[PDB]
Amino acid sequence: FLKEELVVAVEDVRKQGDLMKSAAGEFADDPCSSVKRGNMVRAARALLSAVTRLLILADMADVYKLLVQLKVVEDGILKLRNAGNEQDLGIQYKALKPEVDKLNIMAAKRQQELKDVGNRDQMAAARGILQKNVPILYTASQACLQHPDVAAYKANRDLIYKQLQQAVTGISNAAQATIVDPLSFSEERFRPSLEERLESIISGAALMADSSCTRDDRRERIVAECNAVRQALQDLLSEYMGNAGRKERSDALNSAIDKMTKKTRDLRRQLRKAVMDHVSDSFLETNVPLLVLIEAAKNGNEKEVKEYAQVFREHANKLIEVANLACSISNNEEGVKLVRMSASQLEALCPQVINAALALAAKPQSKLAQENMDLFKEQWEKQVRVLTDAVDDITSIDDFLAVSENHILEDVNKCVIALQEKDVDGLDRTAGAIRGRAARVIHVVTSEMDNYEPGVYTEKVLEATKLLSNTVMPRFTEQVEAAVEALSSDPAQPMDENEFIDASRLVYDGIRDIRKAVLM
Amino acid sequence: FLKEELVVAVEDVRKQGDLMKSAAGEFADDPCSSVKRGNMVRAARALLSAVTRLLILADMADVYKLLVQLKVVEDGILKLRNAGNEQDLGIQYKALKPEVDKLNIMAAKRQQELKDVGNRDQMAAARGILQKNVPILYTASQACLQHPDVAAYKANRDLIYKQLQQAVTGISNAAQATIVDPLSFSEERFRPSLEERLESIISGAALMADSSCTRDDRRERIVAECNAVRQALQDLLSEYMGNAGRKERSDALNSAIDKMTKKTRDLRRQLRKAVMDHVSDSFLETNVPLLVLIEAAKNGNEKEVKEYAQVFREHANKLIEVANLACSISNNEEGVKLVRMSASQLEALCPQVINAALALAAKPQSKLAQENMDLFKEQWEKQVRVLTDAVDDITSIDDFLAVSENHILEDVNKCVIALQEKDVDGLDRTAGAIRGRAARVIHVVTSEMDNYEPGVYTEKVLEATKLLSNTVMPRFTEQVEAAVEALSSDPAQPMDENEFIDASRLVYDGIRDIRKAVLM
């Protein structure tokens, strides 16, 4: 198998190589010779075969190598979880750290070798989870030995083990392996025949919408633009059916499709201007399911914690979905991998967050718990911001600023009208959304400017950003709360409508002068 | 470009080869060395690159070569068509015969090189038509010079030229290279939401019948089974509308669809057992529009020839349609291409057949015409049998024998009853249909057995086939005519009812023991 095949391969490669050299030579001395030429050709082909045979054999060498190390790490992981005393536990992790690393290398190898990108993604995703959890399993399984009466800890340890076991299998599964979608799909229509097989590849493969999980506007917009392009496709399939044979150029009918089909591809640009906006219709409030999910457990409340798991979990994955929708549309693979990977890790760091809350809700005094939470908290936010920053790039920074401009405008007035309606519950709420999108805008603008060389362009932009967050925003928040303390205190002190409006306007305008500075 | 690149390629291949040899060596003396090993690997990869670079360059050499020869044959073909005197004409064909051949070789080269099979098919199809027509163009364009007042000849010559021009382009087009429908449709239903978008993709896309262009039975059968499955779909769309959300398993309602929808897919199997039967309800009589369409023109009858064009043309295309219906249902692409292609060629060889008859009907003595017809006749039948054999495979040989069993039975009795009714016009007619389906059965049975290894199974089958065509059939035909000469001769000689029935029964039985032998 191993060495066996190798020597054998070296042979074929050696022999064919010699015959190729001579042939190549005889051709060099007589390049204007047709025969001597053909000889060189056949020779080249023969060389290819010998060379490839070695590559294939070489692939086995790598695969096998991956297997050996894979099985080693498998047992090691289970041995770590089953550790009973801190002595054995510490001993296992040390003998596993290297084994894990080695496998990590070998994994990256097959990852590249795997042809179809799909499997390649699985390999990297599996490798990641494996790489991240291995250390965590140690910390989890360790806690169970210090507090054997904390089912919460045991449950966590096992969940990590589960994910780890998954990764290992995923590596082997992908090791046996051997893009956008609307882009490549739209490029298919041009022939004087078979209108029956094209009508099926353009019909049954052009019916995949999505929508949902967005605000009412995004649903409406998507509904209108999706119907306008569906009709478009049918105008292309009903008008095209009249070309026949000789119409192999561009007349009134063939172009009746070329003007409808070639232009209506807009649906794509519609779903984008419809998704990228989620970033401000349910984002910045990223801490919302953590800075309370923790406070619950941190207060010895085992009840409002169980119910919060779903609440937390819900807002989380919902965010990842939109991140995926951003992947469906984006021929950018390098960036899709980033997003899809950042999503996987963050998708795997989910159960851990819950386990933490569980162990803390039962022991809001256990310094080990309060620290375990604090630690997990840090890792969750850290993994969130990245997935977020990874996505902010999968899209157009500029487009983001555009949608943020309109939406900001909407919520801004929602507050202004709330100030008039003297509805604090709304005044507060709306104001918050304003602070959200605003900051979400300053972060994306700045994080995107790190790819540009400092200068007039970067200066005029950051300044516009500095103002909105340093001068603007504060004066507005100062007015929001100022209004609140004018109806909940005593009967109801008179609110200064003026300053509130002008202050709030600065917010919107601020975004405007930043967007304008971004373009320039 | 050519030689230029070559010498260059030989270099990279030469240098890399040397470095590879040494590396391979150092590894041989120390195979247990990891470093020396890696070296060998990197070396192997480097060799691959040098080798490939040569292959690519080599591809150009072949492509270019194809181009040169392609342009040569192009002009030659046009020069042949424009020939005015038998002198120049004969001269061109001779200087083209070789040019054509050379290109034929070069074409076969790129054909293999082309990666995607699709283009590969085009290359072969284009090459074929080019190979076949080149000689024909000569015979056609030649006739026009001997009888300049025969538009029929001119029209033919040009059509050949058109096809030839097509092939050439098709070769160059493919040289730049590197599904079913009911099957994929039925696999769509499984989700706790959006019952409004699924109801439209399962309703508006499940309404495409056909029927017609068959005997009364095939229309009735199709009508019954199409209505039984239409109702079925509505039992799936009316019962499904009650799953809601939690019903994500398989209860009484969700399965009320799973038992109706999952079983009624039979409509498909109905349209098949309804189409494959055409093969004996309007086939074998394939010569019928030729062995008379010719006799007409061959008798200097320019009148019954014009009217026969439509008659001939009608029976032809009708046959192709059914061949297409056999394509709609058959996920087999490789076979569909065959059928669809065999149909195209035969669909293009149609106008030519007519042109022949036209030129002969006007000159039933012109040895040039009588030969042109004889030639065209051969090509039409040849292209027919193939399209036919191509289709006989797109279906189930066994199923064909089944339907042939029932239909034979019907026509058989139609004759027996005709013998009793003493209706010769029917006796003759029916008997013919019997001889048709019968032979159509023996050919399909034998042509299908060429895919099986000779032995007991093949023996017991062919014999059953041999009997039906050697012993059976004859004794029956002998009785049919024998009965005819028993009422048209003198007043009406007494017919021997006995022998006629027994003889005719052999026909049916013959088919039975062949079908049974096919199964076994």
PDB file of N, CA and C in Angstrom, chain B residues 21-52:
ATOM      1  N   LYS B  21      14.364  13.974 -11.497  1.00  0.00           N
ATOM      2  CA  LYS B  21      15.134  12.737 -11.474  1.00  0.00           C
ATOM      3  C   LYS B  21      16.019  12.653 -10.235  1.00  0.00           C
ATOM      4  N   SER B  22      16.799  13.702  -9.995  1.00  0.00           N
ATOM      5  CA  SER B  22      17.686  13.742  -8.838  1.00  0.00           C
ATOM      6  C   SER B  22      16.891  13.579  -7.548  1.00  0.00           C
ATOM      7  N   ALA B  23      15.859  14.403  -7.387  1.00  0.00           N
ATOM      8  CA  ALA B  23      15.013  14.352  -6.201  1.00  0.00           C
ATOM      9  C   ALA B  23      14.500  12.934  -5.977  1.00  0.00           C
ATOM     10  N   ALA B  24      13.940  12.342  -7.027  1.00  0.00           N
ATOM     11  CA  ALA B  24      13.413  10.985  -6.949  1.00  0.00           C
ATOM     12  C   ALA B  24      14.502  10.038  -6.460  1.00  0.00           C
ATOM     13  N   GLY B  25      15.710  10.222  -6.981  1.00  0.00           N
ATOM     14  CA  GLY B  25      16.825   9.380  -6.592  1.00  0.00           C
ATOM     15  C   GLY B  25      17.143   9.467  -5.112  1.00  0.00           C
ATOM     16  N   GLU B  26      17.448  10.672  -4.637  1.00  0.00           N
ATOM     17  CA  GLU B  26      17.773  10.872  -3.229  1.00  0.00           C
ATOM     18  C   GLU B  26      16.725  10.257  -2.313  1.00  0.00           C
ATOM     19  N   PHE B  27      15.492  10.165  -2.799  1.00  0.00           N
ATOM     20  CA  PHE B  27      14.419   9.582  -2.008  1.00  0.00           C
ATOM     21  C   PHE B  27      14.483   8.060  -2.036  1.00  0.00           C
ATOM     22  N   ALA B  28      14.928   7.514  -3.163  1.00  0.00           N
ATOM     23  CA  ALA B  28      15.032   6.069  -3.327  1.00  0.00           C
ATOM     24  C   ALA B  28      16.051   5.473  -2.364  1.00  0.00           C
ATOM     25  N   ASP B  29      17.177   6.159  -2.204  1.00  0.00           N
ATOM     26  CA  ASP B  29      18.239   5.698  -1.318  1.00  0.00           C
ATOM     27  C   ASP B  29      17.852   5.859   0.149  1.00  0.00           C
ATOM     28  N   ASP B  30      16.822   6.659   0.403  1.00  0.00           N
ATOM     29  CA  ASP B  30      16.361   6.895   1.766  1.00  0.00           C
ATOM     30  C   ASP B  30      14.846   7.095   1.782  1.00  0.00           C
ATOM     31  N   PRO B  31      14.082   6.033   1.481  1.00  0.00           N
ATOM     32  CA  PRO B  31      12.617   6.105   1.463  1.00  0.00           C
ATOM     33  C   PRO B  31      12.002   6.348   2.840  1.00  0.00           C
ATOM     34  N   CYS B  32      12.738   5.994   3.889  1.00  0.00           N
ATOM     35  CA  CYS B  32      12.259   6.179   5.253  1.00  0.00           C
ATOM     36  C   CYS B  32      12.543   7.588   5.763  1.00  0.00           C
ATOM     37  N   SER B  33      13.005   8.454   4.866  1.00  0.00           N
ATOM     38  CA  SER B  33      13.310   9.836   5.217  1.00  0.00           C
ATOM     39  C   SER B  33      12.125  10.735   4.880  1.00  0.00           C
ATOM     40  N   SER B  34      11.637  11.471   5.874  1.00  0.00           N
ATOM     41  CA  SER B  34      10.501  12.362   5.671  1.00  0.00           C
ATOM     42  C   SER B  34      10.871  13.572   4.818  1.00  0.00           C
ATOM     43  N   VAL B  35      12.025  14.176   5.092  1.00  0.00           N
ATOM     44  CA  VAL B  35      12.464  15.337   4.322  1.00  0.00           C
ATOM     45  C   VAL B  35      12.661  14.946   2.865  1.00  0.00           C
ATOM     46  N   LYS B  36      13.615  14.051   2.620  1.00  0.00           N
ATOM     47  CA  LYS B  36      13.897  13.588   1.266  1.00  0.00           C
ATOM     48  C   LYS B  36      12.596  13.229   0.562  1.00  0.00           C
ATOM     49  N   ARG B  37      11.600  12.829   1.345  1.00  0.00           N
ATOM     50  CA  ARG B  37      10.300  12.467   0.799  1.00  0.00           C
ATOM     51  C   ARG B  37       9.596  13.715   0.281  1.00  0.00           C
ATOM     52  N   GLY B  38       9.430  14.702   1.157  1.00  0.00           N
ATOM     53  CA  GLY B  38       8.780  15.938   0.761  1.00  0.00           C
ATOM     54  C   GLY B  38       9.387  16.478  -0.518  1.00  0.00           C
ATOM     55  N   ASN B  39      10.715  16.471  -0.580  1.00  0.00           N
ATOM     56  CA  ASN B  39      11.440  16.948  -1.753  1.00  0.00           C
ATOM     57  C   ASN B  39      10.899  16.269  -3.004  1.00  0.00           C
ATOM     58  N   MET B  40      10.804  14.944  -2.952  1.00  0.00           N
ATOM     59  CA  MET B  40      10.303  14.164  -4.074  1.00  0.00           C
ATOM     60  C   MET B  40       8.911  14.635  -4.483  1.00  0.00           C
ATOM     61  N   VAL B  41       8.066  14.903  -3.492  1.00  0.00           N
ATOM     62  CA  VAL B  41       6.704  15.362  -3.749  1.00  0.00           C
ATOM     63  C   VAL B  41       6.704  16.677  -4.520  1.00  0.00           C
ATOM     64  N   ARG B  42       7.287  17.715  -3.927  1.00  0.00           N
ATOM     65  CA  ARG B  42       7.353  19.022  -4.571  1.00  0.00           C
ATOM     66  C   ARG B  42       7.909  18.887  -5.982  1.00  0.00           C
ATOM     67  N   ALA B  43       8.899  18.014  -6.138  1.00  0.00           N
ATOM     68  CA  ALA B  43       9.520  17.783  -7.436  1.00  0.00           C
ATOM     69  C   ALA B  43       8.490  17.240  -8.418  1.00  0.00           C
ATOM     70  N   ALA B  44       7.747  16.227  -7.983  1.00  0.00           N
ATOM     71  CA  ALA B  44       6.721  15.612  -8.817  1.00  0.00           C
ATOM     72  C   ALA B  44       5.750  16.671  -9.327  1.00  0.00           C
ATOM     73  N   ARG B  45       5.297  17.534  -8.424  1.00  0.00           N
ATOM     74  CA  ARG B  45       4.369  18.602  -8.779  1.00  0.00           C
ATOM     75  C   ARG B  45       4.978  19.512  -9.837  1.00  0.00           C
ATOM     76  N   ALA B  46       6.237  19.887  -9.632  1.00  0.00           N
ATOM     77  CA  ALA B  46       6.939  20.757 -10.568  1.00  0.00           C
ATOM     78  C   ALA B  46       6.994  20.119 -11.951  1.00  0.00           C
ATOM     79  N   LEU B  47       7.193  18.805 -11.986  1.00  0.00           N
ATOM     80  CA  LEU B  47       7.260  18.083 -13.248  1.00  0.00           C
ATOM     81  C   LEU B  47       5.914  18.172 -13.957  1.00  0.00           C
ATOM     82  N   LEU B  48       4.841  18.012 -13.188  1.00  0.00           N
ATOM     83  CA  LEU B  48       3.486  18.070 -13.723  1.00  0.00           C
ATOM     84  C   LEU B  48       3.301  19.364 -14.513  1.00  0.00           C
ATOM     85  N   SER B  49       3.632  20.486 -13.882  1.00  0.00           N
ATOM     86  CA  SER B  49       3.503  21.794 -14.514  1.00  0.00           C
ATOM     87  C   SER B  49       4.216  21.866 -15.861  1.00  0.00           C
ATOM     88  N   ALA B  50       5.491  21.496 -15.882  1.00  0.00           N
ATOM     89  CA  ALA B  50       6.268  21.521 -17.115  1.00  0.00           C
ATOM     90  C   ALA B  50       5.593  20.671 -18.187  1.00  0.00           C
ATOM     91  N   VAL B  51       5.162  19.474 -17.799  1.00  0.00           N
ATOM     92  CA  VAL B  51       4.503  18.559 -18.722  1.00  0.00           C
ATOM     93  C   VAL B  51       3.207  19.148 -19.275  1.00  0.00           C
ATOM     94  N   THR B  52       2.353  19.646 -18.386  1.00  0.00           N
ATOM     95  CA  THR B  52       1.080  20.233 -18.794  1.00  0.00           C
ATOM     96  C   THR B  52       1.270  21.384 -19.773  1.00  0.00           C
TER      97      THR B  52
END
